[PDB]
């Protein structure tokens, strides 16, 4: 219901974060804070993402 598209490349260092590339689509699971838990549509990996790196 909340689908977002990546605007920038992000490489995760912390194990509970989600890496992605410019243009990747993700579903947002949780929005508590400025780091949102999301899931990749391509890999179905889950993790937190920088909320300002994504749109819509």
């Amino acid at each position: 219901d909340i689908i977002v598209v990546a605007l920038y490349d992000y490489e995760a260092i912390h194990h509970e974060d989600l890496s992605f590339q410019k243009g990747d689509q993700m579903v947002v699971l949780e929005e508590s804070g400025e780091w949102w838990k999301a899931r990749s549509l391509a890999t179905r990996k889950e993790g937190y993402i920088p909320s300002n790196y994504v749109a819509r």
Binding site: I13, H15, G33, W35, P50
Partner: protein, 108 residues
């Protein structure tokens, strides 16, 4: 290219994971320490991962400098106004070496 990521606090787990990633990537181990290089690393962590540069301090000299933030697993070792190199120690994951030597930093 990448903008500034939202800020978050440093934890023991995050310090561990950043330590392990740097050991796996390569570059830090064996490198000669300099204030300029310490700033490049601290500011990189801050722009990419949103941890403020307040966790990468070591015990004052002389001798081996030990990390003040439990979870940071690099230590500064002198080699033969010193000259120091970064060195990973896995013992640092389980022994808070700074708290063992300087309890006053952590008593209150």
């Amino acid at each position: 290219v990448r903008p500034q990521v939202p800020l978050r606090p440093m934890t023991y787990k995050a310090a561990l994971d950043i330590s392990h990633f740097l050991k796996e990537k390569g570059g830090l181990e064996g490198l000669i320490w300099s204030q300029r290089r310490q700033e490049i690393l601290d500011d990189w962590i801050y722009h990419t991962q949103g941890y403020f540069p307040d966790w990468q301090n070591y015990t004052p000299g002389p001798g081996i400098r030990y990390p003040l933030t439990f979870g940071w697993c690099f230590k500064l070792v002198p080699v033969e106004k010193e000259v120091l190199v970064w060195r990973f120690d896995s013992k640092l994951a389980f022994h808070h070496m700074a708290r063992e030597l300087h309890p006053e930093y952590y008593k209150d």
